[PDB]
Design a protein around this nucleic acid. Structure first.
Ligand code: SF4
Lengths: 695, 83
DNA sequence: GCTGCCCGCCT
RNA sequence: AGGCGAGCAG
């Protein structure tokens, strides 16, 4: 037997390779995987007829010696019209690896005298492997019977790998990255000058601390230039062979720049940034994001300022390194502005030393923030709930965990899957403003009204047609998740140790995220169904209108509203009184809808609302400033403009006179030209070529 | 097109900006939609907005260079656009 | 990432 | 007639 905790996967040469660790890293190449093709017989036809007709044709086309085909009975209740609910299908296991034309698919519309519909024609090898083997996220695999690992094995058939019940998960090889960048005004390419590498192999103290550096103008390792630096990086990265790579904004800036500088120098060992070995770059190097995501498959992208990471620190506003450290760790770090174009870095040793010190500080801070906010554990729970890629879970997808959960749950129940508002009160409110989140609005609607694919009779020909309300599959899954969350709350009531309390906090937040990402399945998506989405939207409209009436009855004025959150004005200037009123409103709403559990999300001592999603406020946590949607968030406005805006907001008759005084002396500064120029910078993207604009 | 032709003509003959607002607002026998949509355009016409360009009136050449009038249009040179 | 349409705003 | 912001369907 072979025991291996898998972490990632990739697709090459019609083969599926799982990247995992055996604790040292290991490989398993999975050959013999078969797309599960399901053919729906005509009215009065049997899977034996489909077998007799298509199977010899499939042998002729694909040149096999034998094809496994059996009749199996399965359901269908999705949006494809005139497909009967229950019938007898013919399961043909067509392997991904075929002697001839392995890149040609069978269209879903193959109409024959035996069958008229085809399913699984474009199934994904990783998706099919995970669905058939029912693998719900990264866990143990029981394996029985080309890479940068020390252990490399393979299995001839997919059934040789069976998931294990064990809940433990061994030590990971972590690696934080923070890279100083240089811009060369000749080619406008971001050249790497120094890298700090820190490995947490198993305020935690790193096992090792390494810093490479190249001269920008003319342990710590010194190099003559960039190329030897980066080759040594690749070699020591293979030696380290980390399970997870950590950093700040690695997803769309830093790893992109690293890969581009990897190509520009033409290094051969650039495949050590992932775990899969390669000799040459993909031929065609939006698509670049996908290509580095593919090559790095095997090493785990842990971005802490990415979408998933930033979703865990809403108290951040720019999500910068010092700010995130300050908010998550309550520790002060002053960011040092290091620009290597300055001539002092070519001859002054002390400046280069301070730059390296700041780089090492940045790397330690990134790692500490990563471990503090517990991104890894939360994403692990999300993936084990969804059964998708945990690489995808960190990557920051929307249709990633809204599809594989439905795939797993419906395939475990023998279901054929289809192939792949109130106007705002604009102005300043003196009283406290409470943020209340209705993220559990639609899922409660689904579970309460039993809306699903198998319960709501909807005219499939006319998707614009609204059906009528009818236990469903989706409501049962949602109710099970909610009951798991209830058990989590009950154990929180009793638990003593902070550690397990925090773990259960992660667990409850994971269930809340999974349950509240369930509308992305049919609203936005491989499971889109307009009648259901529009129905639930209507019912949520009804619930929101009732909530408005209740708020008006409790002497409250709603300032702004949507299906995602409801803003309320308490009418008191006390934090305690506002909290009490918000709790009362939550209780009354939960009384009017027993499955709609709402809560207090954020508190605003002072709120200046400008539009639907454009506002600024004094968040109480201590009061902290917040802004969403004002001009001080766009690129086209200089840091001086943002500073003027932040001070104006902080000030807001004495406040207005102070605003006038500040405007006068900043004008006197500007006309005299007594303000540093970099405060006047304006940035703006072009999605097109510079020559290619009418205006 | 008719609005622009007529506005720049009436500027060229010498109508004041305030009397221009007065007349244009009068001819539309709401004020809300006016202040919402037409006031800014009329003030832009007199160069009293934007880059501060007091746009010189269209001539018969430029007016003819405008796309041909249709139903609901009255701009152009009627020695052309009429029968 | 690309197109059509609806509204809001500026030149 | 054009650009900035969203929402929709492909
Ligand atoms: S030719 Fe036509 S457009 Fe030109 S001045 Fe005479 S009437 Fe006006």
């Amino acid at each position: 037997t072979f025991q291996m905790f898998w972490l990632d996967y990739c697709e090459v040469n019609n083969t599926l390779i799982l990247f995992g660790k055996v604790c040292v890293s290991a490989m398993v190449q999975i050959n013999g995987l078969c797309r599960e093709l399901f053919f729906l017989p005509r009215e009065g036809k049997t899977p034996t007829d489909i077998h007799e007709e298509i199977i010899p044709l499939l042998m002729d086309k694909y040149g096999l010696d034998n094809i496994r085909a059996k009749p199996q009975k399965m359901k269908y209740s999705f949006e494809l019209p005139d497909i009967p609910s229950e019938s007898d299908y013919l399961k043909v296991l067509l392997p991904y690896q075929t002697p001839k034309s392995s890149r040609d698919t069978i269209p879903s519309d193959l109409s024959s005298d035996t069958f008229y519909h085809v399913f699984g024609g474009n199934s994904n090898i990783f998706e099919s492997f995970v669905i058939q083997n029912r693998i719900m996220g990264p866990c143990w695999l029981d394996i029985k019977g080309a890479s940068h690992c020390a252990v490399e094995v393979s299995v001839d058939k997919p059934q040789n790998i069976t998931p294990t019940t064990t809940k433990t998960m061994p030590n990971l090889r972590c690696l934080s990255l923070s890279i100083q960048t240089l811009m060369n005004p000749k080619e406008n390419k971001q050249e790497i000058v120094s890298i700090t590498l820190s490995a947490y192999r198993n305020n935690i103290k790193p096992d090792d601390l390494c810093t490479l550096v190249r001269p920008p103008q003319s342990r710590v390792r010194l190099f003559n230039n960039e190329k030897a630096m980066l080759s040594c990086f690749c070699a020591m990265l293979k030696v380290e062979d980390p399970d997870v790579i950590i950093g700040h904004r690695l997803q769309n800036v830093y790893l992109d720049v690293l890969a581009h500088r990897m190509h520009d120098l033409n290094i051969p060992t650039f495949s050590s940034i992932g775990r899969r070995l390669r000799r040459t770059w993909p031929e065609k190097f939006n698509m670049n994001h996908f290509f580095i995501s593919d090559i790095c498959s095997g090493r785990l992208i842990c971005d802490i300022a990415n979408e998933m990471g930033q979703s865990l620190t809403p108290k951040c506003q720019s999500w910068d390194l010092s700010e995130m450290y300050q908010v998550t760790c309550e520790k002060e770090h002053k960011p040092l502005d290091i620009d290597y174009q300055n001539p002092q870095y070519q001859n002054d040793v002390n400046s280069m030393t301070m730059a390296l010190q700041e780089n090492i500080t940045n790397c330690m801070i990134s790692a500490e923030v990563s471990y503090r906010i517990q991104l890894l554990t939360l994403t692990k729970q999300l993936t084990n709930l969804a059964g998708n890629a945990w690489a995808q879970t960190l990557g920051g997808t929307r249709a990633g965990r809204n599809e594989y959960i439905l795939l797993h749950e419906f395939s475990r129940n023998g279901f054929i899957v289809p192939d792949k508002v109130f106007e705002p009160e604009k102005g300043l409110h003196k009283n406290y403003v409470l943020v209340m989140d209705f993220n559990s609005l639609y899922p409660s609607i689904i579970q309460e009204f039993n809306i699903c694919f198998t319960t709501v009779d909807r005219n499939k020909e006319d998707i614009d047609e609204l059906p009528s309300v009818p236990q469903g599959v989706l409501p049962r899954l949602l109710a099970n998740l909610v009951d798991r969350r209830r058990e989590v709350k009950k154990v929180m009531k009793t638990e003593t140790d902070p550690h397990k309390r925090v773990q259960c906090d992660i667990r409850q937040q994971a269930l809340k995220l999974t349950a509240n990402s369930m509308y992305g399945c049919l609203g936005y998506s491989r499971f889109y169904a307009k009648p259901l989405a529009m129905l639930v939207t209507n019912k949520g409209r009804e619930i929101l209108m009732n909530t408005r009436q209740l708020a008006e009855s409790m002497n409250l004025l709603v300032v702004y509203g949507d299906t995602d959150s409801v803003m309320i004005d308490t009418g008191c200037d006390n934090y305690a009184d506002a909290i009490k009123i918000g709790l009362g409103f939550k209780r009354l709403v939960n009384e009017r809808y027993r499955l709609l559990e709402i809560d207090i999300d954020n508190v605003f001592k002072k709120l200046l609302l400008h539009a639907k999603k454009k506002y600024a406020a004094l968040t109480v946590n201590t009061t902290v400033l917040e802004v969403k949607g004002l001009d001080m968030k766009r690129r086209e406005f200089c840091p001086l403009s943002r500073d003027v805006s932040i001070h104006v907001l902080n000030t807001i008759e004495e406040a207005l006179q102070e605003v006038y005084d500040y405007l006068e002396d900043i004008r006197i500064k500007v006309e005299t030209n007594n303000i540093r120029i970099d405060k006047y910078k304006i940035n703006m993207k072009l999605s097109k070529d510079p020559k290619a604009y009418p205006g | 097109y008719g609005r622009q032709q007529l506005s720049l003509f009436l500027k060229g003959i010498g109508l004041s900006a305030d009397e221009a607002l007065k007349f244009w607002s009068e001819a539309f026998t709401t004020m809300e939609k006016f202040n919402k949509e037409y006031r800014y355009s009329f003030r832009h016409n007199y160069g009293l907005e934007g880059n501060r360009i007091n746009y010189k009136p269209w001539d018969c050449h430029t007016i003819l260079s405008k796309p041909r009038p249709g139903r609901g249009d009255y701009h152009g040179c009627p020695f052309r656009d009429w029968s």
